[PDB]
Curated annotation (Swiss-Prot):
Expression (tissue specificity): In the egg white and polymorphonuclear leukocytes.
SUPFAM superfamilies: Lysozyme-like
Native organism: Gallus gallus
Top-rank taxon, per record: Eukaryota
Molecular function terms, GO-annotated: beta-N-acetylglucosaminidase activity; identical protein binding; lysozyme activity
InterPro entries per the UniProt record, alphabetical: Glyco_hydro_22 (IPR001916), Glyco_hydro_22_CS (IPR019799), Glyco_hydro_22_lys (IPR000974), Lysozyme-like_dom_sf (IPR023346)
Coiled-coil region(s): none
Protein name: Lysozyme C
Known partners and oligomeric status: Monomer.
Amino acid sequence: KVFGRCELAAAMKRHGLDNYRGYSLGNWVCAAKFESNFNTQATNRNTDGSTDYGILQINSRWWCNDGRTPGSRNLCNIPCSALLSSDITASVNCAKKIVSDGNGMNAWVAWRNRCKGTDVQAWIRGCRL
Ligand SMILES: [Cl-]
Ligand SMILES: [Cl-]
Ligand SMILES: [Cl-]
Ligand SMILES: [Cl-]
Ligand SMILES: [Cl-]
Ligand SMILES: [Cl-]
Ligand SMILES: [Cl-]
Ligand SMILES: [Cl-]
Ligand code: NA
């Protein structure tokens, strides 16, 4: 599923992500934009052999099981395939664990490089929320 910008903002809000760990909704929408272009089915292999999954490109090295990332963990206790669903519940619940891990949203390198410090409210501007 390819979400619309305001559609995803509303789904993220419904699943409790707005201001989660102090990160406003626009931060989450901005991160999803540059991780996946709002496509729940996005996958991207990493040089280390892990794979990133879903709207927030959650990595198999630590967070989900895909059966092919040697020495990895599954700290969200989910198959990585669950992160590709049209229903964003699994991605949101796992992102809550990731953003609580110590470095906030810097865990998402693209958030640090393309969202951090910018006018992230632009990503929810005009949306009925
Ligand atoms: Cl957009
Ligand atoms: Cl917010
Ligand atoms: Cl915002
Ligand atoms: Cl594995
Ligand atoms: Cl584990
Ligand atoms: Cl599994
Ligand atoms: Cl959803
Ligand atoms: Cl923080
Ligand atoms: Na894993």
